[PDB]
Amino acid sequence: FKEIESHLVSATARKDAVEALIAYFAYHRLFEALFRCTLIEKEAYAAAAARLERCPEALRLAVRHGVTTIRRKTARAIIDHIVQVLPPLLAGYVKVLYEFLDNPASAENIAALSGEGWEVCVDFCIDVLSRFGTHVAVDVLSCLYMLCIAHNAPIQRKADRLPHVVIQLLQLRQMKIGELQKMAFATFNIVFQRMQAEDVALCKTLVKQVVPLLSHWWQPMLNSIRDEMLKTLYGTRLYIQALLREESFPQDVEELLDTLWCDYSRREERARLQLDDITFTNMLLPPDHPRTGIFSLRPHHTAGEQNWALLENLAILEAAYSKHNRVHQKLHSLDPAVRLSALQLIPFLTRHKKPSLEDVAETLEDLSKHVTAKQAIVASWAMLACSSLAIHEVSRHPSLSSSWKQLWQLAVRSLSLPPISRASCVLLNSILKANLIPRHELADDINQIVTTADISGPAILVDASLGLMLNLLRFRNNMFPNASQATSNHIIRWVFVRWSPAELTYASLHGTHATPYDLVNLLRACYGISPLVMAQPLRLFNGPIVLHWKEQAEMEPFIRYLLLLAGSNASRRLALELFYPKVEELQELAESWQVSMERLRSMVLACLTGALLLPDLVNINSSLSRDLESAVFSIVDATLKVILNSPPSENLFGMILASSAPYIPHLIEPELIALKRERPHLLKFFGKLSEALYERSRRETLPRRDILLSYTPEAFYLETSLRIHFLDIIRLNDGEIGRIPEPIINQLAGLSGEQFLCCREFMREIFTSDAIVPLGGATTILETAGHIVSRYEYACCEVALCNCIDIMDSFINLWTDNHFDIAEMAGDLYHYLVKQSLPNNSMSAAAQIRLASLLLHLLEVKSEYASNLGLPSSQSTLLKILQDGPMKLKHYIGLEIPKLFGLYVLKTHDDIFVDVLEHLPSDPDVVEGLAFRLFVLAELACRWPTLLRRSIYHTFEI
Numbered sequence: 038f039k040e041i042e043s044h045l046v047s048a049t050a051r052k053d054a055v056e057a058l059i060a061y062f063a064y065h066r067l068f069e070a071l072f073r074c075t076l077i078e079k080e081a082y083a084a085a086a087a088r089l090e091r092c093p094e095a096l097r098l099a100v101r102h103g104v105t106t107i108r109r110k111t112a113r114a115i116i117d118h119i120v121q122v123l124p125p126l127l128a129g130y131v132k133v134l135y136e137f138l139d140n141p142a143s144a145e146n147i148a149a150l151s152g153e154g155w156e157v158c159v160d161f162c163i164d165v166l167s168r169f170g171t172h173v174a175v176d177v178l179s180c181l182y183m184l185c186i187a188h189n190a191p192i193q194r195k196a197d198r199l200p201h202v203v204i205q206l207l208q209l210r211q212m213k214i215g216e217l218q219k220m221a222f223a224t225f226n227i228v229f230q231r232m233q234a235e236d237v238a239l240c241k242t243l244v245k246q247v248v249p250l251l252s253h254w255w256q257p258m259l260n261s262i263r264d265e266m267l268k269t270l271y272g273t274r275l276y277i278q279a280l281l282r283e284e285s286f287p288q289d290v291e292e293l294l295d296t297l298w299c300d301y302s303r304r305e306e307r308a309r310l311q312l313d314d315i316t317f318t319n320m321l322l323p324p325d326h327p328r329t330g331i332f333s334l335r336p337h338h339t340a341g342e343q344n345w346a347l348l349e350n351l352a353i354l355e356a357a358y359s360k361h362n363r364v365h366q367k368l369h370s371l372d373p374a375v376r377l378s379a380l381q382l383i384p385f386l387t388r389h390k391k392p393s394l395e396d397v398a399e400t401l402e403d404l405s406k407h408v409t410a411k412q413a414i415v416a417s418w419a420m421l422a423c424s425s426l427a428i429h430e431v432s433r434h435p436s437l438s439s440s441w442k443q444l445w446q447l448a449v450r451s452l453s454l455p456p457i458s459r460a461s462c463v464l465l466n467s468i469l470k471a472n473l474i475p476r477h478e479l480a481d482d483i484n485q486i487v488t489t490a491d492i493s494g495p496a497i498l499v500d501a502s503l504g505l506m507l508n509l510l511r512f513r514n515n516m517f518p519n520a521s522q523a524t525s526n527h528i529i530r531w532v533f534v535r536w537s538p539a540e541l542t543y544a545s546l547h548g549t550h551a552t553p554y555d556l557v558n559l560l561r562a563c564y565g566i567s568p569l570v571m572a573q574p575l576r577l578f579n580g581p582i583v584l585h586w587k588e589q590a591e592m593e594p595f596i597r598y599l600l601l602l603a604g605s606n607a608s609r610r611l612a613l614e615l616f617y618p619k620v621e622e623l624q625e626l627a628e629s630w631q632v633s634m635e636r637l638r639s640m641v642l643a644c645l646t647g648a649l650l651l652p653d654l655v656n657i658n659s660s661l662s663r664d665l666e667s668a669v670f671s672i673v674d675a676t677l678k679v680i681l682n683s684p685p686s687e688n689l690f691g692m693i694l695a696s697s698a699p700y701i702p703h704l705i706e707p708e709l710i711a712l713k714r715e716r717p718h719l720l721k722f723f724g725k726l727s728e729a730l731y732e733r734s735r736r737e738t739l740p741r742r743d744i745l746l747s748y749t750p751e752a753f754y755l756e757t758s759l760r761i762h763f764l765d766i767i768r769l770n771d772g773e774i775g776r777i778p779e780p781i782i783n784q785l786a787g788l789s790g791e792q793f794l795c796c797r798e799f800m801r802e803i804f805t806s807d808a809i810v811p812l813g814g815a816t817t818i819l820e821t822a823g824h825i826v827s828r829y830e831y832a833c834c835e836v837a838l839c840n841c842i843d844i845m846d847s848f849i850n851l852w853t854d855n856h857f858d859i860a861e862m863a864g865d866l867y868h869y870l871v872k873q874s875l876p877n878n879s880m881s882a883a884a885q886i887r888l889a890s891l892l893l894h895l896l897e898v899k900s901e902y903a904s905n906l907g908l909p910s911s912q913s914t915l916l917k918i919l920q921d922g923p924m925k926l927k928h929y930i931g932l933e934i935p936k937l938f939g940l941y942v943l944k945t946h947d948d949i950f951v952d953v954l955e956h957l958p959s960d961p962d963v964v965e966g967l968a969f970r971l972f973v974l975a976e977l978a979c980r981w982p983t984l985l986r987r988s989i990y991h992t993f994e995i
Contacts, residue, residue: 042067045074051088055095062098065111071096072118079122086125093129101136108829109146112137116147116154120161128173131165134158135176138183141742142830145187149833150877152191159184159195163202171212178206178220185227188743188835188881192231200228200243207250214258222265229272230588234595234924235965244276245286252293257300260343264582267346271586274350275593278357279600290358297351298367302374310348310381312417314341317463318500318552320699323574325587329384330425331463335549337695339580339750346582352385365396368403377415380407383422387429397431401440408447413456420448420460424467432473441473449482449493458497459550466505469512480516487513487524490531498535499550503559506531510562525563525608532559533615539626544639553645554699560612560650565605569649575699578753584745595928599968606657613654613661620647620668627675637679638692644673644722645697651718666718673722677729690733691750694757697726701760705806706775709767720768727765730758738791742834744883752795759784759799776809786821793825797840804847815848816859823866838874838884841866846891853899864906871903871914885918885926893933896940912937916956924969927958931973935980946983954991967995 041057044050051074075092078085100107100115115137119130138144138158148155162181166174181203184190192199207221225247232240251266280286301309315332327334327345334345355364364386368379383400392400404426407419423444426432432441445468451461468474486493487509495502506528513524536556537543558568579587623643647669655662680689700719702708712720740749747756759781766778785793785800800818804810810818822844831837845863852860870888874880880888892911895902903911915937919930934953938946957973958966971992978988 038067042070045070046077048084048088051078051092055088055091058095058098062095062102064099064103064106065114067099068096068111068115071099072114072122075126076122079126089126090129093126093133097129097133097136100133104137104140104143107137107143109149112143112147113154116157120157127170128176131173131176131180134161135180135183138180141183141186142834144184145189145833146829148187148190149879152194152878155184155187155190156195159199163195163199166202166206167198169206175216175220178203178217178224182220182224182227185224187833188883189833189879191878192228193235196228196232196236196239200225200232200239203228204243204247204250207247207254210253214254214256214262218254219258219262219265222262222269226265226268226272226585229269231923233272233589234592234599234928237599237965241276241280244273245280248273248277248286248293249289252289252296255296255300257296257303263347264343267343267350267582268585270350270354271346271582272589274353275596275600275602277354278360279602281357281361282602287358287361290354291363294351294354294358294363297347297354298375298378301347301351302372302378305374306414308344309377310341310344312459313549314338314344316500316550317459317504318555319504320552320554321571321574323577325590326577327583330388330428331384331421331467334583336575336577339578342580342582348382348385352382352388355382356386356390359390362396365400368400373415376407377418380404380415380418380422384425387425392429392431394431394434394436397426397429398437398440401426401437401444405440405443405447408444408451416451417457417460420444420451420457420464424460424464427464427467427473428471432471438473441468442478444468445474445479445482449486452486452493453496455497458495459499459501459547462495462499462501462505466501466508469505469508476516483509483512487527490527490534494531494535496535497547498532499547500552500555502535503551503555507559507562510559522604522607525565526611528559528563529608529612529615532556532563533612533619536619538619538639538643539623541636545633545635548635548639548642551642552699553642553649556646557649561653564609564612564653566653570702571699573703576701576753576756577698577748578750579748584741584743584748587745587748588743592925592928595924595972598972599965609654610657610659613657613659613665616654617661617665617668619643620665620672624668624672624675627672627679630679631675632679634687634689634692637676637689638696640672640676641693641696644669644676645700647672648718648722649700649716652716669718670721670725673725677725681729681733690730691754693726694754694761697722697761698753698757701757701764704760704763704803706808709764709774712764713768713771720764723761723764724768727761730761739794739836742836744835744839746794746836747798752798755792755795756799759796763803775807777803777811777814779811779814782811782814782818786817790825790828790831793821794836794840797836797843800840801843801847804844810848812858815851816862819844819848819859819862819866823862826866827869832874833879835881835883838870838880839887842870842884842887842891846887846894849891849894849898853895853902867903867906868908871908875914875918882923882925885922886929889915889918889926889930889933893936896937900940916953919953920956920958924965927969928972931969931976934973935977938977938981938984943983946981947987950977950984950987959995970995 038057041050041054044054046069071092075089075096078088078092082089115133119133123130144155147158159181162177162184165177166181169177185192203221203224207218212218229240229243247269251269254262255266277290281290314335316335317332322328322333322336327349329349335341364379364382367375370376370379383404401423404419404423408416408423410416410419427441427444444464448461448464451457452465469479482493486495487506495505510524510528514521517524536551538548554569554571561567561569623640627640651666651669654665680693683689701723702712739746740751746752762784763778763781766780767774770778781803785796788796822841825831826837826841845866848859848863851857852863870880875885875888892915895911899905901910903909903914908914915930919927919934922930937953938949941949957970959970960966974988974992977984978992
């Protein structure tokens with residue numbers, strides 16, 4: 038290689054050196070060799086062509102092998118060589134670029150001190166495209182995209198020609214479909230997400246251009262292309278509603294509406310938003326979840342998000358087009374698939390249409406026409422649409438009251454067919470909650486349902502069946518207080534007649550619908566004890582579409598502004614008798630196993646339901662107690678042993694964690710005390726699960742670098758594993774509550790650089806909670822969390838910075854109390870983040886937000902720490918950040934700045950207000966700046982009355 042290095046910088050030397058390199062496949066020197074060798078051959082211009090094609094092939098194969106131990110010096114060197122040698126060698130050089138950018142930390146660390154080199158690369162690719170091989174063109178758009186996904190990529194500078202380039206390319210209505218269009222739409226999404234609240238004019242023009250081009254490349258791979266176009270529609274959802282309120286665009290948008298309808302209506306039954314992609318359960322799902330009026334997207338469904346995305350976006354664009362009745366016409370359509378699609382689009386749309394009395398009445402008449410459609414699909418969806426409309430204030434008008442009776446009627450009989458036993462139940466429940474029919478017309482039918490329970494019972498025992506049965510139990514303990522054991526005993530009989538877990542039709546068809554939460558809540562009601570607690574939002578993971586929507590979710594108010602738009606013992610023994618056979622049959626089915634997803638999931642839901650109500654069914658103590666516990670836990674053990682010895686491709690542990698999570702508590706001391714007092718059998722379950730986890734680990738990089746990495750499947754599984762470990766240790770120690778168990782910390786500080794970032798939400802959750810941590814605990818945790826941030830592969834990535842800021846925030850009051858051993862570490866890290874990380878153009882938007890929160894919290898504890906360490910004051914850093922920062926950070930701070938005036942005596946508020954206003958945006962050519970200024974002044978005013986005078990004065994001033 039040394040003599041070969043001299044050989045490169047005589048064709049037997051060059052071609053031979055490249056052959057020896059290919060055989061091969063500090064570095065800086067060989068890289069110089071290759072560069073100047075290609076240059077010597079370039080000036081020394083078919084053999085010439087072959088040697089030119091073959092030298093940077095060796096180059097690119099070297100940049101796929103030292104691209105790990107490369108640094109910014111070698112980065113700039115390679116980049117300037119690529120842009121200097123070329124004024125033939127397109128594909129080789131572009132390949133070197135592609136393989137240099139494939140490593141994300143590379144294209145992020147080039148977004149350092151200036152953006153000179155980043156702009157060099159982006160302009161390289163823009164010029165290359167605007168010249169436009171064809172596959173090389175795809176690689177050009179790919180490396181352009183790979184540059185644009187860097188949340189500290191300075192885009193605003195080279196943001197004039199870039200979108201026009203990308204969406205000028207796409208206007209070509211040929212080159213049937215491939216990576217080209219997927220990458221076109223990916224760069225569009227990212228650049229638009231940047232420039233969504235800066236350069237409003239550019240954006241309105243762009244959307245006026247890409248609402249047409251979207252109604253063409255939606256020709257009815259294609260999975261990912263429909264996904265990118267649905268993300269695009271999620272973005273543009275606001276410019277469309279603004280433009281329609283401001284005349285080609287109406288024609289174009291209507292044509293696009295009809296392309297969406299024509300595409301969705303020929304999707305007959307497999308992938309058409311099946312009725313198993315929604316749940317009617319009354320769990321505490323998080324607020325940012327996707328939901329519509331009655332149902333909501335089934336948790337942990339990364340496979341049914343595209344259909345919900347399409348229907349959600351279509352409902353929004355339709356209620357935003359009929360604003361400036363396509364749906365009722367399509368409802369009276371002829372082709373049955375069109376009527377089915379118009380039956381699906383009723384709840385999504387009524388979530389935001391605010392219909393009038395005539396429209397509600399008419400649509401309801403037609404739906405009562407469609408309810409009896411002899412068809413599981415159509416009758417079901419029709420009843421769901423009806424029960425979506427039945428939850429207004431418009432529906433409670435007498436002009437259609439008998440109509441409700443009709444629908445009630447058309448459901449009271451439609452309860453015994455397992456095809457439509459779910460939707461029908463929903464309907465009943467809806468009418469029994471909104472009170473559209475008085476409490477004497479509907480008493481005989483309820484008596485029939487609850488006393489008979491074999492005809493006009495909810496034939497299937499799913500989420501909505503249990504909801505309705507609970508509402509009926511309460512109705513009948515409210516009207517006929519005498520004969521309440523009748524209700525409770527009929528209820529228990531129905532529950533244990535319908536709940537057959539160890540059967541193929543149940544376990545495979547509607548096993549996913551029914552959850553242990555609903556079962557045990559109904560049973561605890563009919564005994565008479567109490568609900569399950571479930572006092573916090575469920576934890577779940579999502580897929581790309583919903584995550585991307587969760588990115589553009591905090592900033593939608595600023596875009597709606599910038600755009601200007603003893604008997605109990607009888608019943609318990611009854612239930613125990615009726616229940617034990619279920620466990621016996623389950624244990625026989627389990628002994629046979631020493632297998633699919635559905636049978637195994639049903640068995641684990643059954644063992645959860647068993648472990649939940651053991652503390653119920655032991656006060657019986659009629660010798661069917663010991664046997665019950667032993668049998669339940671024998672099922673649990675057999676299940677775990679099927680789970681372990683299995684391929685990690687089914688991912689059964691995904692199933693068990695996803696099912697068992699909603700019962701894991703919050704990790705504070707009082708809740709972990711009430712888990713040792715009320716539900717201990719759940720704790721024994723969690724112990725067995727922890728053992729299986731430990732052992733499966735004994736047997737054997739980053740999916741996304743956003744702030745949302747902790748909502749992807751990988752992160753959810755890691756956080757759940759560690760909460761399970763935590764609960765197990767707490768159970769065993771029995772008094773080591775709260776005090777973070779040193780084994781848990783040693784499992785925290787014994788992970789990889791890819792996982793410490795994944796479990797950061799778990800670290801936040803434990804540490805923020807009041808919990809004695811060992812000295813070495815906080816010290817070691819902080820040592821490792823800091824070490825992640827100084828590796829040149831994480832020095833720029835968003836997630837590492839956010840995580841180290843959060844961990845410093847967790848122990849805010851150790852270093853700012855005394856001088857410990859940790860105070861030096863936090864000093865070093867504060868200094869590196871403030872003085873060094875921030876002006877280097879390395880902190881991203883979410884990193885700057887997390888640092889703003891760190892500072893705003895620091896002022897409430899020390900308020901001068903940054904001086905006693907030798908830096909400018911914290912407030913100085915905060916406002917310096919406010920002046921220069923991507924509008925997302927400006928919005929966050931302006932929203933949480935009116936809390937900065939809470940740490941100061943009332944005498945000095947106009948002084949602080951002068952100081953702040955010194956650091957706002959103000960320039961007449963920039964209208965976004967003035968918009969932000971008026972925004973923050975309105976916020977201060979609407980919170981602090983002291984600053985109302987100056988807020989109004991400066992609002993009228995500009």
